[model samples]
Target: NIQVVVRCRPFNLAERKASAHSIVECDPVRKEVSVRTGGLADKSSRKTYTFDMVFGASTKQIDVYRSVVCPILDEVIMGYNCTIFAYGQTGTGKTFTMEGERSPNEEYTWEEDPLAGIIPRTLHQIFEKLTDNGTEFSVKVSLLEIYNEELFDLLNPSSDVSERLQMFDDPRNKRGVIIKGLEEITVHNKDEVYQILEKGAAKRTTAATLMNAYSSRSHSVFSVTIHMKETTIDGEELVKIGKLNLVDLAGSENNINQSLLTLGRVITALVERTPHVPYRESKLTRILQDSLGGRTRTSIIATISPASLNLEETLSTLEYAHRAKNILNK
Candidate 1:
């Protein structure tokens, strides 16, 4: 089943100055999120939704990693393909939850940074657990960005940031597509992974400068493939492979050429059990076809703002996330 969760971000400095009040309430114990529908005076006018998990504004980044990514990483190491994506409006912490920002004072290293989010934390934990278990493993990572229906390899060192990549249907894997010229760098340690992340982030920033709203408009999929060799008591050696896909999706907002629209359509079709899913309608949906309802285990972190100003978008995000929970994958 696709695990769905909601995260509510605290009020920003601007919202604080404007005295924006919170319209969303998160109950971690109940795993529910409640939103105020009517004015502040109408206490009864509200809506509540249940999910696999709920994180309030006070939740820390480390808390998110330990609660969500840890178990998924275990599954990935056990030879199962897993995916986790963040979906939300612009400025609502989608990027923050995936690739966290560093502190200004250089207070702590990236490995120990409390603000470090899923990608870095997950990579670090993978190395830690694998080394501790004394497993003969090799890890390879690839970062891809989807913008305006085009694919760009963020981790390709020799390729220019503007270079586009091609995707073709994989013959061996019916649900997978092979991306041409996609660079998958072998990472032996956590430090190498951090450096790779920095390079990709720098490339993303370069594209952002050339195009307005690049980060908010683009979807990034960072994948890690782990190959582990294990020997049985019968003197037979077997290799197990697992894949983990960490996706930072484009902001769930109105746009002229938004792939999020097709994602919503695909979700609706799946929930309605339509004959055709329309996965090929958009590049994002096509790439995520397996994670949606195929064989991969998937999870969605629906980010939201607690301020009343973004109540409409918040509610929309919650609704989509709730509907997504109904989608089952083998």
Candidate 2:
């Protein structure tokens, strides 16, 4: 696997060395990029980038999906296994940027927008290309979430919300949410993805907090396995097994005005580097160990507040992103 490089700060996103995903809307009136973490001001004319940021020896979900992710879906009719995952602190743009334009009209508007998250966006892009006489390929999707030292099956069709999850023993899984029911489906067009999106978004767990209006409480992962075989203009067999796995991580921020005392203390522990950081305390961390410590291609988009009130959190978050790079992925 070739490592895709990422430098978060100072470099303009449009000018990010590697063409990452596009920021769907830029509100001119607000002069901001409404990322999932929060609205980021675009007035980064100063190039004297200071404070540490996260980078990777290799590229990850952000670089792939933002740059040529869709095209990969089109060209890989032969079906190659590829993965895209988001990495960063809680309340970062992991959820927001991962999710694509919710709908045509409501996308630009913050209110009444369709729930178009990462998994949904990629699915739509895939079939749209196929429908346009692009290629012959099909897709299948699986969903999972990690919470409270347990793996919960949000996508389990049993309609059992209260169903608790326990760790399973598998050689591949050191620690992470291993979806119990994994299946891939053959897709014909973009509409099928849309149908899936409609159903999937409905099942996600969200809570209202001062940090974010629609904060994802759990770490949500979605995979779109594209089973494709390539053919020339005249139609000839090429390769198969082209796949793309898109992941959206949960952002962490306590209710700013409303204090989540326990969560605040825990986050503080992580930031201050307490004798022990209880990453295992939360479901989000256990699954992320691979990207954070194990060998994997990863990137992070940290959200910061320019206002003085957020200076501490912003600084701490940046510092957190810095330690992320130090973790050995070898």
Candidate 3:
């Protein structure tokens, strides 16, 4: 089952100064979100939706990691493919919840930073857990950014950041595709992963400056694959492989983006169980085809705004995320 959760971000300083009141109320205990439909004056008009989990404005980053990523990471270590997506409108904590920002005073290391989001935290925990288990394993990561229907490798060391990558069908796996020229860096420890993330982030920032709306318009997929060796009772060596995909999707507000549009169509088709699911309609969908309605355990962290100003986009995100719960994967 695709675990769908909704996270409502707190109002910013500007919103508070402008007297923006929260129209979205989250009941984490009940895993429901109640939205005021008829503005602040009409108190009785409200719409409520339920999900696998709900996080309110005051929810901490570690809380999200422990509650959501912890279980997924465990499954990944046990040789299961998993994906977690951060989806929402721009400025609503999509990027903040995925990559996170550095601390202001330089108080803590990247691994120990309280503001460190899913990517850093996940990598750190992976090292901690795997090392403790004394397993003979290897971790490899690849970061792919899709902008304007083109694929860019953020972790490619030798190539220019602007160099586009091509995709071809994976002959071995019908539901998977092989990305041509994408770099997969082998990471031995958390420190190496942090440096890799920094390099990729710098590349992303450089490209963002070159092309406006780069961050908000691009979808990033960070994948970590773990291969571990086990010895059978008969002294035979066996390998167990697991994969985790952390996707930071582009803002979903604009209808002009082909990838986002195609993702919506794919979701609809999956939920509706249509005869033909158009996974090949766009590059984003093609890359994520295996994760959606396929044999991968998937989770969606649908970030939303608590302010009433973004009611439309918030509601759309909620409805879309709610529908995603119906997509069943083996």
- What order do candidates take by lDDT, descending? 3, 1, 2
Cα-based RMSD of the predictions, in order?
A: 1.6, 10.3, 1.8
lDDT of 2: 0.46
Model 3 alpha-carbon miss at residue 68, Å: 0.4
lDDT by residue for model 2 (46-155), tens: 11122222232133344535554554455444344444555444544466556645556545432224444445556666666555654556676766554433354545
In model 1, the runs with Cα more than 4 Å from the true position are 41-44, 231-238
TM-score of 3: 0.96
Best by lDDT: 3
lDDT (Cα atoms) of all candidates against the true structure: 0.88, 0.46, 0.89
Question: Total clashes, candidate 3?
Answer: 0
Q: List the residue pairs that clash in candidate 1.
A: none
Query: Candidate 1's residue-wise lDDT over 1-330, tens digit each?
Result: 789999898998988899887888999999999999886644559999999999999999988988998999999988999999999999899988988888779899998888888988888988898887647899999988888888998887787878899989889978778888999999988778778888888888788887678888888999999999866556666688999999999888764555678889888998888888989888888888999898999999999998887878988999999999989879
Q: On residues 1-330, what C-alpha lDDT tens digit does candidate 3 reach at each position?
A: 899999999989988889887898999999999999787655558999999999999998999999999999999988999999999999899888988888998899887888889999988888898787546788999999898888999988788766899999999978789998889999988778778988897888778877769988989999999998856457766688999999999998852678898889999999999979889989989998889998899999999998887889998999999999999988
